[PDB]
């Protein structure tokens, strides 16, 4: 009743952020209120998201909660790098962890700080999308 599946997901994400679970790497946490995302504003979605991310998000039950989750994941990954968000691509699969790819200036910026691997976790509900990006050097 009290501990919904969103609070489990976010408590597991913040459990893997502590120094004991992982240390010596770039850590970025971004939250996004889903109400901030406007899916009808096609200029924001085309600018800041890849066509594959838009195709994935549009096929989800809650479209706005998926775009808020992907937007939070891009902003978490950009904070983890520590250096337009279309450069960072998040390939999310059903009942699977999302994977991070860097294409344009983010791919250069990751090589500048000697960042090889970047993982991301996402938890999104009817209020907020929280994303935690851990970048190993």
Curated annotation (Swiss-Prot):
Family (UniProt): Belongs to the thiolase-like superfamily. Fungal fatty acid synthetase subunit alpha family.
Binding site for Mg(2+): 30-32, 123-124
Further remarks about this protein from its record: Present with 17000 molecules/cell in log phase SD medium.
Subunit structure: [Alpha(6)beta(6)] hexamers of two multifunctional subunits (alpha and beta).
Annotated residues for binding of acetyl-CoA: 30-32, 56, 66, 75-83, 92-95, 122-124
Domain of life: Eukaryota
Result after altering residue 132 to E: Does not affect oligomerization but lacks transferase activity
Result of changing residue 30 to S: Loss of transferase activity
Posttranslational modification: 4'-phosphopantetheine is transferred from CoA to a specific serine of the Acyl carrier domain by the C-terminal PPT domain. This modification is essential for activity because fatty acids are bound in thioester linkage to the sulfhydryl of the prosthetic group.
Annotated effect of mutating residue 27 to D: Does not affect oligomerization
Name the record gives this protein: Fatty acid synthase subunit alpha
Gene it is expressed from: FAS2
UniProt function note: Fatty acid synthetase catalyzes the formation of long-chain fatty acids from acetyl-CoA, malonyl-CoA and NADPH. The alpha subunit contains domains for: acyl carrier protein, 3-oxoacyl-[acyl-carrier-protein] reductase, and 3-oxoacyl-[acyl-carrier-protein] synthase. This subunit coordinates the binding of the six beta subunits to the enzyme complex.
Full-protein interval shown: 1743 to 1886 of 1887
């Amino acid at each position: 009743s009290y501990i919904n599946a969103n609070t489990i997901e976010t408590a597991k994400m913040i459990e893997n952020m502590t120094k004991e679970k992982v240390s010596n790497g770039g850590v970025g946490v971004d939250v996004e209120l889903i109400t901030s995302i406007n899916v009808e504003n096609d200029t924001f979605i085309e600018r800041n998201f890849t066509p594959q991310e838009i195709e994935y998000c549009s096929a989800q039950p809650s479209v706005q909660s998926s775009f808020a989750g992907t937007w939070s994941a891009k902003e978490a990954v950009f904070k983890s790098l520590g250096v337009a968000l279309k450069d960072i691509e998040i390939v999310r699969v059903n009942k699977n962890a999302p994977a991070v790819e860097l294409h344009g200036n983010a791919k250069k910026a990751a090589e500048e700080a000697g960042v090889t691997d970047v993982k991301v976790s996402i938890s999104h509900d009817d209020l907020q999308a929280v994303a935690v990006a851990v970048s190993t050097k």
